[PDB]
Every structure is written in C-alpha cells, then in structure tokens.
Amino acid sequence: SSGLVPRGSHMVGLIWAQATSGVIGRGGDIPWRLPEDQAHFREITMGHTIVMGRRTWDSLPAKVRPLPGRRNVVLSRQADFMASGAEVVGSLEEALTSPETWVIGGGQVYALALPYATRCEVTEVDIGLPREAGDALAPVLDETWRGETGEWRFSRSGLRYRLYSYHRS
Ligand SMILES: NC(=O)c1ccc[n+]([C@@H]2O[C@H](COP(=O)([O-])OP(=O)(O)OC[C@H]3O[C@@H](n4cnc5c(N)ncnc54)[C@H](OP(=O)(O)O)[C@@H]3O)[C@@H](O)[C@H]2O)c1
Numbered sequence: 730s731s732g733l734v735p736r737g738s739h740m741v742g743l744i745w746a747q748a749t750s751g752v753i754g755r756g757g758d759i760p761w762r763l764p765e766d767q768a769h770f771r772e773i774t775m776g777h778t779i780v781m782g783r784r785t786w787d788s789l790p791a792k793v794r795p796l797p798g799r800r801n802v803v804l805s806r807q808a809d810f811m812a813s814g815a816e817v818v819g820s821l822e823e824a825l826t827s828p829e830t831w832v833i834g835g836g837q838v839y840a841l842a843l844p845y846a847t848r849c850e851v852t853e854v855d856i857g858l859p860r861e862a863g864d865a866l867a868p869v870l871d872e873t874w875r876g877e878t879g880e881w882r883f884s885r886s887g888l889r890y891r892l893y894s895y896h897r898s
C-alpha cells in the first residue's frame with residue numbers, strides 16, 4: 730500500500746468507534762462519549778467527502794448537520810428522504826466519486842462499503858457493553874486486512890481506549 734492518494738483514484742476508508750464487544754450504536758445513538766475519539770474522527774475526515782447511512786444522518790442533531798469542513802453524502806433508498814445541506818444518493822456507486830472518501834457509519838453502511846475499502850481507522854473503548862438485539866455492530870475484518878493495534882490509552886473521561894489502523898490492497 731501507499732499513503733499518497735492520486736487524484737485519479739477512488740480511495741475508500743471506514744472509520745468507527747466500538748466498545749470491546751463490537752457495539753457501535755444502540756437506540757439511534759452512540760452509547761458512550763469520548764472526546765479523544767471526536768477529535769480523532771475530525772482529524773482523519775476533515776477536508777474529505779464523508780458518506781453515511783440515512784440512520785446516521787438522523788442521529789446527528791439537526792443544528793450540527795451537515796458536518797462542517799466535509800462534503801456530506803447520505804445513503805437512502807427512500808425517494809422522498811431529504812438531507813438539508815447535503816446530497817442524498819441511492820447507492821454506494823453514486824457516493825464514491827471523490828478521490829478520498831471516508832465512510833462514517835453506521836452498521837449497515839459499513840458492511841455495504843467494506844468490499845471497496847482499503848483502510849479502516851478504529852477507536853476501541855474499553856467499556857463493558859454487551860451486544861443486544863437491534864444493536865449496530867462494527868464490521869468484522871477477515872484475514873485480508875493487516876492491522877496495527879495501539880497500546881491502551883486513558884481518556885480524560887476515565888475510559889481506556891486504543892486506536893487501530895487496518896489496510897489492504
Ligand atoms: N460508533 C460509531 O463509530 C458510529 C458511527 C456512525 C453511526 N453510529 C450509530 O450506528 C447506528 C446507525 O447504524 P445502522 O446500521 O442502524 O444504520 P446506517 O448504516 O447508519 O443507515 C442505514 C440506512 O442506510 C440506507 N442504506 C443502507 N444500505 C443501502 C444501500 N445498499 N443503498 C442505499 N441506501 C442504503 C437505508 O436508508 P433508508 O431506510 O432511508 O432507505 C438504511 O436504513 C446509530 O445508533 C448511530 O448512532 C455509530
């Protein structure tokens with residue numbers, strides 16, 4: 730792999746935060762808050778196109794969306810769903826037109842985008858959140874993904890967390 734992104738290519742990355750159980754979402758929200766993760770998510774995605782599921786757009790408070798500094802693209806199959814300030818498309822093929830795209834959730838769209846992704850950036854939060862029915866979950870990465878696992882760090886909010894970076898060809 731290479732860190733340089735040619736402008737004629739179409740690099741797709743996924744970025745998410747999970748509990749150690751793999752839970753990423755419950756009841757339309759993220760069931761923790763971690764300021765180091767919010768800063769990390771902004772550092773990675775700023776200046777790029779972000780692609781999200783309709784349900785992830787819904788989870789953003791109206792006053793904050795579309796997320797600033799980034800082209801917001803929302804995936805929906807509903808012909809009458811609209812996202813003020815952002816573009817709604819009906820497929821991943823229509824959304825992945827930029828040279829660098831970060832898929833920012835949620836559970837459904839991660840699984841949808843994984844076959845095209847070459848990078849994942851993960852935050853793992855050491856919170857004991859067991860999986861319940863209806864939870865959004867992080868995608869599982871098969872053996873074609875090579876990962877770098879950071880050591881455990883400690884949040885100002887009192888949770889342990891660590892970062893992973895995965896790549897593949
Ligand atoms: N921890 C994190 O990193 C993180 C990040 C983001 C979100 N989240 C959480 O994850 C949850 C949401 O995830 P989710 O899996 O329920 O939903 P989602 O992936 O965010 O969005 C699902 C919606 O995307 C649309 N969609 C899915 N597949 C499609 C396809 N093939 N073509 C076109 N549109 C398609 C559909 O919208 P329509 O129904 O309108 O057709 C579907 O209902 C929330 O709890 C949110 O807080 C967590």
Ligand SMILES: CCc1nc(N)nc(N)c1OCCCOc1ccccc1C[C@@H](C(=O)O)C(F)F
Binds near residue numbers: 766833
């Ligand atoms: C941040 C959670 C997250 N973390 C990783 N690692 N990946 C993701 N895809 C991810 O979800 C992004 C979509 C949900 O957004 C939010 C959820 C709760 C609070 C604030 C934001 C706004 C956001 C912004 O305004 O940029 C950020 F700064 F915090």
